[PDB]
Assembly symmetry: C3
Amino acid sequence: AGAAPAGGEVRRVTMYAERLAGGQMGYGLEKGKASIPGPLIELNEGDTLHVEFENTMDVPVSLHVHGLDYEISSDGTKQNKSHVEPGGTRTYTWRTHEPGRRADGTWRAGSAGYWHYHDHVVGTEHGTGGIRNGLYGPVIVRRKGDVLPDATHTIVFNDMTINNRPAHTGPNFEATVGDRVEIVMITHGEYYHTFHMHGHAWADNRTGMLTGPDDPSQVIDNKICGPADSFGFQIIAGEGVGAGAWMYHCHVQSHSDMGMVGLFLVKKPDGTIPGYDP
Amino acid sequence: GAAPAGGEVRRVTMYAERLAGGQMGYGLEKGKASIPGPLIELNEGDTLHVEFENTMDVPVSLHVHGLDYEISSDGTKQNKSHVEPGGTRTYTWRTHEPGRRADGTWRAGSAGYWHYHDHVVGTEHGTGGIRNGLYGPVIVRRKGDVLPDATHTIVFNDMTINNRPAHTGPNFEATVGDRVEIVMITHGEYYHTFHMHGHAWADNRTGMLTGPDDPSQVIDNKICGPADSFGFQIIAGEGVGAGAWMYHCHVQSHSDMGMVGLFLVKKPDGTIPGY
Amino acid sequence: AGAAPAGGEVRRVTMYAERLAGGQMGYGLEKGKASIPGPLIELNEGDTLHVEFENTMDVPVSLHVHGLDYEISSDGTKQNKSHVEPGGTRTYTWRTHEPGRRADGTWRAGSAGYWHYHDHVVGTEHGTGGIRNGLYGPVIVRRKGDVLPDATHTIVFNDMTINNRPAHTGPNFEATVGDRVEIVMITHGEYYHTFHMHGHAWADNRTGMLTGPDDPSQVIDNKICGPADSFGFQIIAGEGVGAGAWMYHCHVQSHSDMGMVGLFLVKKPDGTIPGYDP
Ligand SMILES: [Cu+2]
Ligand SMILES: [Cu+2]
Ligand SMILES: [Cu+2]
Ligand SMILES: [Cu+2]
Ligand SMILES: [Cu+2]
Ligand SMILES: [Cu+2]
Ligand SMILES: [Cu+2]
Ligand SMILES: [Cu+2]
Ligand SMILES: [Cu+2]
Ligand SMILES: [Cu+2]
Ligand SMILES: [Cu+2]
Ligand SMILES: [Cu+2]
């Protein structure tokens, strides 16, 4: 349960770019604890986040965010001289805003949504190598009153992997029937995909939930998405369908056949998953 | 008219058969398998028990998008709810209306344009069965939804429409004024862009704006990928009159290679001008 | 903020198809002034446009429009024998309508939206050769009260080009901070793309702007699109982010690396751009 508070706090966080095993690179909030996808960044509309960023690698890296407000000096592009030299540090500043009525009378949308950050300088001047190595992460910006979940899982379709994992190796995620589960879904690389969840549908809008009986957003369980698209939704685990090993996968047929599959294990209260047998 | 509130327990029997030259299909009676398979329509609240029978020499399953089912009705080998050659099984699909949850949020109803397909032929994601023609449309209506005079199903399965040979349509006929409903499904390996000459729709659940407050983009072109489903209703010839109105994938090599047909909109006397 | 009036005017223009340098083809409103993309046609909901069209080329060409009302006589296809022979002429007629309640109580959508026109006859019966050559252009149909921009810019992703240009030639677009800028984005050809704008987001709906605090459309800065997709939006240039050279690009990694990139040059009031090299 819960709802998002009105935002406006100034926050600081340490971020590191680190080599990981397998030629992979990752972001982390703590030295030695980088992860792919990188750490989830949660902000409420109006918050400011000062990211004290350190590049612990032997090659330049950058941090570039979708959707938030930044001045060009926190762009994370080499083109604007906001990348980070090997061993260097720099403070990237992100700002967010509430919606509101402009003086001209139009409506200014807020920053709330499902967003992401990624490298922009490794391999190419668009971060093609660093994205491919794992330098991407989720950003959620909440509007005041937004329903909060019991858990949030990030699913990144990165070329032909999920979260840079080997073919047919999840990730799986667990919930109990009735848990309010939040999915952040991000795509990267060269390929278009279609993201599909067995047993669970969501609304194709900002929060993934219909606002009420007046909301005309299509209700879907299958969504085409391409490089750098990002969306999210919230579902009630097992709602209307019960416990089980509920597949999610890319529905591009060869993509699922070659490994782009994982499991949303929905448990009964006693912890069991009927008919689940790997 | 419009659609009623649902809550009926419906039954249907569905067969999977082989068809000419390696294709495979679903049907309501044997020897009558079609590609795409039979349209299933429900009202939110309805339950459907599909008495399924596999008539083929290989396993098959029935898996549906969007509807409520238990893990036992998955239609996946993974959960052992596939059907062995010659075997039978009853799949149960449920639907629900929208309403406020216990937690105060709004729960979406089942209404939408959906589809069902095989999941075990060729691969454990049904790649061979989908290619062969094992897919069909499902419509679930909300109470009050306007009913059409006709419903046509267009599936973009890899480089074909409805598994037909290149440059063979299908065409669909209507008369000016008809309320024409289109179920559009995509399957296989390619993205596509579905496009209709002369008619636009709203990019929302019904394909029609709710009213003057519906901000949905109005479009005549929509990108879709494998297992995307959507639908819409148009008044044929509205504002444009009768004639042979093209629809096609708008990916240029795709239309060029034959993903194209004609929506033949007839004058009340039955003649299509310029055709 | 100035607004679109109600429509209902009958407008007339002349349009020519002409060969252009580099084995190209384009539309223009005056002989010898064709461009790629073709001239922007703007209509108010309910206006009619009669296009006095001439084919100055040695192959059949045509004019086909998305989104607008036309009879098969102006369909623009060899199917409905509405193409234009070499040297020939023809008058194409487009109509638009306002929205309203039908007899049966259902709501008829207006013509308002971001649309486009292209050839349908060169190369094949689907205009593949014409579209590749540059026979395409934008159409904006405005609804009464729609907010009017200070400038409109058309970005067409045509196969692996922007506006048929060579790789890494932009185009760039200039604005001043505070300007209300309108983007028209059209895709053509064989491939999918994902349009991305640095520092500026918009609403995934008809206008690119949220109606108010009840509009649930997702706010995005990244959007997958395929051949003959069209959408548009207005942004306040630099809002929340400030002046600077703001990148836009296809976010498919190999597409950006290979030059599907341009610049949204947002200038301070004095015309300078921080950190940019003119
Ligand atoms: Cu970028
Ligand atoms: Cu995929
Ligand atoms: Cu499914
Ligand atoms: Cu990006
Ligand atoms: Cu599946
Ligand atoms: Cu296609
Ligand atoms: Cu068209
Ligand atoms: Cu499926
Ligand atoms: Cu066409
Ligand atoms: Cu591209
Ligand atoms: Cu960006
Ligand atoms: Cu077209």
